[PDB]
Design an enzyme around this catalytic site. Sequence first.
Site, PDB file in Angstrom:
ATOM      1  NE  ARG A   1      -4.061  -2.523   2.125  1.00  0.00           N
ATOM      2  CZ  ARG A   1      -3.816  -3.616   1.754  1.00  0.00           C
ATOM      3  NH1 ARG A   1      -2.501  -4.143   1.378  1.00  0.00           N
ATOM      4  NH2 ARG A   1      -4.864  -4.363   1.553  1.00  0.00           N
TER       5      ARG A   1
ATOM      6  CG  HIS B   1      -7.114 -16.904 -17.739  1.00  0.00           C
ATOM      7  ND1 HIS B   1      -6.677 -16.154 -18.668  1.00  0.00           N
ATOM      8  CD2 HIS B   1      -6.044 -17.086 -16.977  1.00  0.00           C
ATOM      9  CE1 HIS B   1      -5.573 -15.556 -18.417  1.00  0.00           C
ATOM     10  NE2 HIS B   1      -5.194 -15.762 -17.574  1.00  0.00           N
ATOM     11  N   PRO B   2     -10.061 -20.630 -17.652  1.00  0.00           N
ATOM     12  CG  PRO B   2     -11.280 -21.543 -15.952  1.00  0.00           C
ATOM     13  CD  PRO B   2      -9.972 -20.945 -16.414  1.00  0.00           C
TER      14      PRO B   2
ATOM     15  CG  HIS C   1     -18.649 -21.795 -13.220  1.00  0.00           C
ATOM     16  ND1 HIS C   1     -18.876 -21.020 -12.261  1.00  0.00           N
ATOM     17  CD2 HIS C   1     -18.460 -20.701 -14.186  1.00  0.00           C
ATOM     18  CE1 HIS C   1     -18.967 -19.735 -12.103  1.00  0.00           C
ATOM     19  NE2 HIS C   1     -18.468 -19.652 -13.779  1.00  0.00           N
ATOM     20  CD  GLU C   2     -16.225 -21.045 -17.294  1.00  0.00           C
ATOM     21  OE1 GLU C   2     -16.093 -20.664 -16.021  1.00  0.00           O
ATOM     22  OE2 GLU C   2     -16.087 -20.416 -18.291  1.00  0.00           O
TER      23      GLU C   2
ATOM     24  CD1 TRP D   1      -9.450   2.271   3.262  1.00  0.00           C
ATOM     25  CD2 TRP D   1     -11.037   2.081   1.820  1.00  0.00           C
ATOM     26  NE1 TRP D   1      -9.372   0.976   2.723  1.00  0.00           N
ATOM     27  CE2 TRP D   1     -10.292   0.914   1.911  1.00  0.00           C
ATOM     28  CE3 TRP D   1     -11.948   2.323   0.661  1.00  0.00           C
ATOM     29  CZ2 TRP D   1     -10.554  -0.051   0.976  1.00  0.00           C
ATOM     30  CZ3 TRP D   1     -12.548   1.390  -0.011  1.00  0.00           C
ATOM     31  CH2 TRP D   1     -11.687  -0.046   0.041  1.00  0.00           C
TER      32      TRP D   1
ATOM     33  CE  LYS E   1     -11.376  -2.186   3.514  1.00  0.00           C
ATOM     34  NZ  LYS E   1     -11.411  -3.527   3.099  1.00  0.00           N
TER      35      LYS E   1
ATOM     36  CG  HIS F   1     -11.788  -5.895  -9.190  1.00  0.00           C
ATOM     37  ND1 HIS F   1     -10.815  -6.701  -8.514  1.00  0.00           N
ATOM     38  CD2 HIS F   1     -12.711  -6.336  -9.884  1.00  0.00           C
ATOM     39  CE1 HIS F   1     -11.239  -7.801  -8.948  1.00  0.00           C
ATOM     40  NE2 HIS F   1     -12.136  -7.829  -9.777  1.00  0.00           N
TER      41      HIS F   1
ATOM     42  CE1 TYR G   1     -16.488 -10.363  -9.384  1.00  0.00           C
ATOM     43  CE2 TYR G   1     -15.899  -8.010  -8.878  1.00  0.00           C
ATOM     44  CZ  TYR G   1     -15.724  -9.240  -9.874  1.00  0.00           C
ATOM     45  OH  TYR G   1     -14.595  -9.388 -10.514  1.00  0.00           O
TER      46      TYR G   1
HETATM   47 ZN   LIG Z   1     -18.295 -17.754 -14.957  1.00  0.00          ZN
END
Ligand SMILES: [Zn+2]
Lengths: 596, 200
Positions: free
Chosen positions: A151, A327-328, A356-357, A459, A463, A487, A497
């Site tokens: 950081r 990566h799948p 999943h895929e 921030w 937290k 991100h 998410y």
């Molecule tokens: Zn997925």
Amino acid sequence: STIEEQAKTFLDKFNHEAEDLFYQSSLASWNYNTNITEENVQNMNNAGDKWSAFLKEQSTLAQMYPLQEIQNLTVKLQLQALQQNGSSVLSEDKSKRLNTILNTMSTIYSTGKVCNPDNPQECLLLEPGLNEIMANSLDYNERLWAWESWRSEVGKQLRPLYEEYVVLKNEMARANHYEDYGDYWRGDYEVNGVDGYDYSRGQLIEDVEHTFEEIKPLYEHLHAYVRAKLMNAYPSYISPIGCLPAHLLGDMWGRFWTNLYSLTVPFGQKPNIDVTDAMVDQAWDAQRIFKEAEKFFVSVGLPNMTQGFWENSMLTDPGNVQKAVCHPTAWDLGKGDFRILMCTKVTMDDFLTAHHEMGHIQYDMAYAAQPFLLRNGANEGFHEAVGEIMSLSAATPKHLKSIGLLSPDFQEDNETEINFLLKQALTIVGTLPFTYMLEKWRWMVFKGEIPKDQWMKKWWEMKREIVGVVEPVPHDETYCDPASLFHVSNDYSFIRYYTRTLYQFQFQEALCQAAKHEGPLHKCDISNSTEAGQKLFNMLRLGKSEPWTLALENVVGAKNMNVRPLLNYFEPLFTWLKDQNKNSFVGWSTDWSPYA
Amino acid sequence: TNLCPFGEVFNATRFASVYAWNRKRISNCVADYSVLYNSASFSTFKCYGVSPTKLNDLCFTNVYADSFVIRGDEVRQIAPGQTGKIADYNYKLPDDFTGCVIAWNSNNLDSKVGGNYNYLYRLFRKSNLKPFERDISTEIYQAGSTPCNGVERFNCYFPLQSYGFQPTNGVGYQPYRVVVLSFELLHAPATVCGPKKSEN
Ligand SMILES: [Zn+2]
Ligand SMILES: *[C@@H]1O[C@H](CO[C@@H]2O[C@@H](C)[C@@H](O)[C@@H](O)[C@@H]2O)[C@@H](O[C@@H]2O[C@H](CO)[C@@H](O)[C@H](O)[C@H]2NC(C)=O)[C@H](O)[C@H]1NC(C)=O
Ligand SMILES: *[C@@H]1O[C@H](CO)[C@@H](O)[C@H](O)[C@H]1NC(C)=O
Ligand SMILES: *[C@@H]1O[C@H](CO)[C@@H](O)[C@H](O)[C@H]1NC(C)=O
Ligand SMILES: *[C@@H]1O[C@H](CO)[C@@H](O)[C@H](O)[C@H]1NC(C)=O
Ligand SMILES: *[C@@H]1O[C@H](CO)[C@@H](O)[C@H](O)[C@H]1NC(C)=O
């Protein structure tokens, strides 16, 4: 002729030309991702450049059909997607500037490296270096050095760039008729002009906040349990009434608590169910794995994979012939061409990933008949929610018995199930306050509700307040700790998410309801239930042509994000956690810090 | 002696674009329809107004063979009472159609890496085709109220577009070859008979 029927003629011409051009870019990109060469880089970028330029011209042309004059909402949606302006609203000096800020922040992050204070030669990158410390180390001071060095060395670089990024991004959003960059991101959830299914950008803040309030009991109890376990692992370092130190959470940020399992497993003597050995004993290969996933979808009434899927997919690492990107990924190239790219290994993990895929592929196949621009998940959280519920069914002991990876005489005991649900919650539940709090800080920064000289102050206040986590050392406004996570410094919205997580249990609860599942939700397998398959398909086939509130209502009978199914999945763990914490403090005081 | 030349139609090297569909008259010959009908070759074999099995027992005045290429998922439009881009703007079968539609996947012949773009179809038209009409005109299609001349081109469109056939496409996007057999019954002497009715 009306402006609407002119717009439909324009869309007919757009669709025919778009589908072929997108397909060529999909092919070039496929060729690079399965065969890394300089030549294929060139093809991929050439085709991506042509695609981008085509979309720019079509956006210009679609600007001539004003939305006012369109009644047909299937037409309005396509036109809406085409006449979005994004960064083109900016001047070209500002647009060139923000791209430079973006690319600098991204490279500062992926090249950030920290060196041993004693030896300026032993240095580490985030990956694999720092991550490996943050995932495995039991040493308070070493975990702290990795948490703080990242950081202060990468974050302090990002701080001036992020402030500028906020200004420009906000300018873009305003010139696109949004209040600010956060309002811009919440647009993905907006629905207008569909009576009884509308949904405003501001409503997302409240629905996220109201659903979070109902997750707090489960979170608090998980927190108190983890906190007591962590005191054993770090004896003098943690207060039984205070927040968890930010550098003890099993990754660089506490995004997930996954890697605390070893420190918090309820019943360390009961091994988890892993059918990897059984699959190796039975001589399974990648083909067998994907054939089994294909069987699972057919059993609920969904179609087989296409002939092309089997001929064109890359289901194993090509190894000594070509270099591939492993990566799948589930690929929807267009023109009926669906593929999976995966370097499959014979593990339980990859067995579950294949389901999943292949769930992504099922979504893609079901909405291929929608017009081109409407072939997508009903909002940004839908696709991954569809993939995740496939792992749920496929990992249950009930399912693994049925396919001969667990012996017909196998029985689940109380303790193994609690181990499983605990592990689940460390990942699934632990990320929810993290995800909500981080995005709330960004939404407020974008709104101008946090002045720059209080960025890090607010921030770490949020937290402590919302997440129950406290910074181990004080940080002034030269830090930019939110940008220390991929991100944030790479410009991806994050609330997806949270919403997807709630969606996935809403989906599973309804699908298991339809399969007449009995017993605790976490044990449900929807296989062989065509009533569940049909309920899923009624939403899958919509793609993006309907409000996401309607697509959701097709699966679950309601229009709203709702955390109760999640809480239901975790109910056996909730009650158990409540018993474990009977001699503990549940909750935390913001007042304590490791440096006070 | 005078067996009908279906091989010239079905096994022809070149096939037409659907908007410019090809017609071949079949006259003065015997036709074993059952050799075709019992073929692993064909993915579509649908007859209307006539039973596919008893075809070898029938006589007709004239038989016509229309042939062209379309997309896999457009074969369903080569049938009576269908609508869509092919049925409305390219090739239209009448409600009282008597005949057979035959189709087979030609991905191996008509696709190409990088795409074969040599097959076209009409995408726009002021009105629908009448049955068995063919339109090969190339006037600019005007969708707006402004005209299509030489300075104004807004809301104007060239009427034909190319199919794009790449071998990796899904089945619904792959090229299919189509033969439409018209069994015409005039008040006139038959010229095309099954093997069973060979003595005219
Ligand atoms: Zn997925
Ligand atoms: C999107 O922006 C345009 C103007 O931006 C220009 O055109 C884009 C297509 C793109 O090429 C950019 O790089 C350009 O800077 C807006 O166009 C206006 O549309 C209104 C009708 O709403 C019309 O009265 C004005 O004449 C247009 N203005 C200009 C300068 O041409 C368009 O409305 C924007 N779209 C949305 C959804 O906001
Ligand atoms: C991968 O790319 C190389 C180019 O050097 C080519 O020779 C090879 O045929 C490619 N492999 C496949 C499977 O297309
Ligand atoms: C919208 O247009 C499509 C195609 O033009 C049509 O199929 C549909 O019926 C229309 N719906 C409405 C509500 O106008
Ligand atoms: C589904 O049904 C088949 C046959 O009825 C059975 O053999 C199979 O084990 C079942 N699978 C599951 C997961 O229930
Ligand atoms: C086309 O060719 C094959 C083999 O070359 C033949 O068996 C078949 O009968 C031919 N089709 C017709 C309609 O004659």
